[PDB]
Amino acid sequence: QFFTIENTQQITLLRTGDEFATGTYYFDTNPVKLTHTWQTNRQLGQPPL
Amino acid sequence: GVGVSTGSYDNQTHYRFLGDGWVEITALATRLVHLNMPKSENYCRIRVHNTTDTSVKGNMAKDDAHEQIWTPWSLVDANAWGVWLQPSDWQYICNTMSQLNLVSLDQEIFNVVLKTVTEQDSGGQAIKIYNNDLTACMMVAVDSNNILPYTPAANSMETLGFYPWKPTIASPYRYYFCVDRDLSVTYENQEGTIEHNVMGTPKGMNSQFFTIENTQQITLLRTGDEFATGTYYFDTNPVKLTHTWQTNRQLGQPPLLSTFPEADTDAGTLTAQGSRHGATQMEVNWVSEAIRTRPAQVGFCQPHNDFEASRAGPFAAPKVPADVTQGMDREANGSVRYSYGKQHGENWAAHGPAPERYTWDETNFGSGRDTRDGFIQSAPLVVPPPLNGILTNANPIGTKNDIHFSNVFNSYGPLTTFSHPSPVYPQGQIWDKELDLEHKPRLHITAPFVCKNNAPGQMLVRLGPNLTDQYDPNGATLSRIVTYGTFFWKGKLTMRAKLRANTTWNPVYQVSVEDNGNSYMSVTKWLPTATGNMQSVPLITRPVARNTY
DNA sequence: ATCCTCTATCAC
DNA sequence: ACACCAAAA
DNA sequence: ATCCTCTATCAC
DNA sequence: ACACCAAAA
DNA sequence: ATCCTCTATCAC
DNA sequence: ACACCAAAA
DNA sequence: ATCCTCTATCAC
DNA sequence: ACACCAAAA
Ligand SMILES: [Ca+2]
Ligand SMILES: [Ca+2]
Ligand SMILES: [Ca+2]
Ligand SMILES: [Ca+2]
Ligand SMILES: [Ca+2]
């Protein structure tokens, strides 16, 4: 599999006065909790009486 | 303002029938609860170390090391089949339905009774006088948002009476706290010492201390008051009410017959394994039910007594229940052993503290595993394997005589498909909360129904501190008027089922009872004695044959 | 707040 | 007092 | 008068 | 039973 | 005249 | 192709 | 001026 | 942010 930037994309030329800008990508992702846990199989629920 | 009941007794069960054979079952539970003053007036962070047992060399699998927080509050768990349905009903549902699912729960408290006792008659002997205080109050609260940790009572056979005409009481609220316990490995006598059997202190990063009072809205209940729940809606997956059988060996196209039996005795034959059509993923130039290709893997091999351990200490790994198989390999296919007691079974006239126990063998056949016959051949498959060309349940691993590949082999994988366990009638747990782990478990062996969203807030109760004329805050430890109480609890559980369809020919297994015998199913078991004693024995859920392919 | 073994004289 | 028992109470 | 650790199935 | 957990329940 | 074991993709 | 299996397909 | 290997978040 | 991948985004 051999690709080439030139045969795959639209290249834009930039001289000194030019400028380039991206679209606006939207992330479709799952959030990340910001808390650690502790409980292990030994501490799950009803502590003995 | 008092002298008038605030609720109504009703422990009925209604079967509402709708079209296409759907059914709306409605569970009615009413129960009389008793309650006395919580000994600790406060919250206690208590510890538990059983050095008396941890010290032995072989002993570890008996470790009870942990540190709980004792709250002066008491829980009111009804999460146990045995509390809602009547023996017979469970029969009915199981003998008639095809699936069951949780719908909604509704709780209610009322007819509060608060009394104080005064031990008098010091001028004669030693009597006790009973009388109720009106102003006195009770306290209720519901952790609807579930800030507090979950504490299922069936997790200890401490739920409520399964017998309506007999009262009951509440399990006290207690929850785990963070420690970091550690224990070393040893066997029968070995040599050396237990290198270190430590406990530990609270860690800043994981210390979590809650308080009913700073988390919930507590409602005061005097005699004429009454309390009532919202109406929780279950968002859960239904449970089939049929066992299966088919195993990898019976999936689809049975081989073609070439020889036809002559009499009801002799059998028939197939075609030459060498000269037989089909497919396999072994190099051999033949074919056999054993090596033929199947859709996927039914059931799988689980590691035996996989005590693993973390900062908490050691513990046995849980494992998906399955049929025990002829091999009678219980601990091998996770059957479960319950130890219930007189409010949850037991006979009643059984003497001594000795709890009654029952082991449940799962009915999802074709999913079980017989350790004995399980074996791994080698490379390039060979008709009859050499010796050093096949590892069996005889050959020992890591130099231990009885430890074989089974106890460490894990068959699980993509093609590994199985069946969800079944519920156990009395004693069994109904629903359960889900672990707040970004990556969940395909199910809990703990219970049948797992809430997809939030879950039923736990209902907490506690009596109110009835003070005396004497009180000093800075005062060491002090007096409070003796007091205890009662109240009725009423629950509403709605379920949905559908009637099974009859399509076989040959009748089918039904749960039934039997005349006065030595049979497991003997009426008498679910009957009163001359003094009125009775037990509740677990019953078969999924008496009827399913199909899986 | 009674109707033929539920809810439900529910079958009006 | 329907409301009568197995349907159309 | 229960909804995922508050109020607040508040997000309807 | 919305109300499915992180947004627009 | 194919829809998850009936009739009944009946649940449209 | 609704019609995603246990409800409101 | 970003949408799953084109043009083309073209499939809106 | 549709526009969640193979259709009818
Ligand atoms: Ca909340
Ligand atoms: Ca009635
Ligand atoms: Ca609330
Ligand atoms: Ca048909
Ligand atoms: Ca583009």
Swiss-Prot record, chain A:
Family: Belongs to the parvoviridae capsid protein family.
Lineage: Viruses, Monodnaviria, Shotokuvirae, Cossaviricota, Quintoviricetes
Written domain comment of the UniProt record: The N-terminus of VP1 is sequestered within the mature capsid. It contains a phospholipase A2-like region and putative nuclear localization signals.
Organism listed in the record: Murine minute virus (strain MVMi) (MVM)
Physiological role: Capsid protein self-assembles to form an icosahedral capsid with a T=1 symmetry, about 22 nm in diameter, and consisting of 60 copies of two size variants of the capsid proteins, VP1 and VP2, which differ by the presence of an N-terminal extension in the minor protein VP1. The capsid encapsulates the genomic ssDNA. Capsid proteins are responsible for the attachment to host cell receptors. This attachment induces virion internalization predominantly through clathrin-dependent endocytosis.
Subcellular locations according to the entry: Virion; Host nucleus
Record protein name field: Capsid protein VP1
Miscellaneous section: The capsids of autonomous parvoviruses expose a proportion of VP2 N-terminus and part of that sequence can be cleaved of to form VP3.
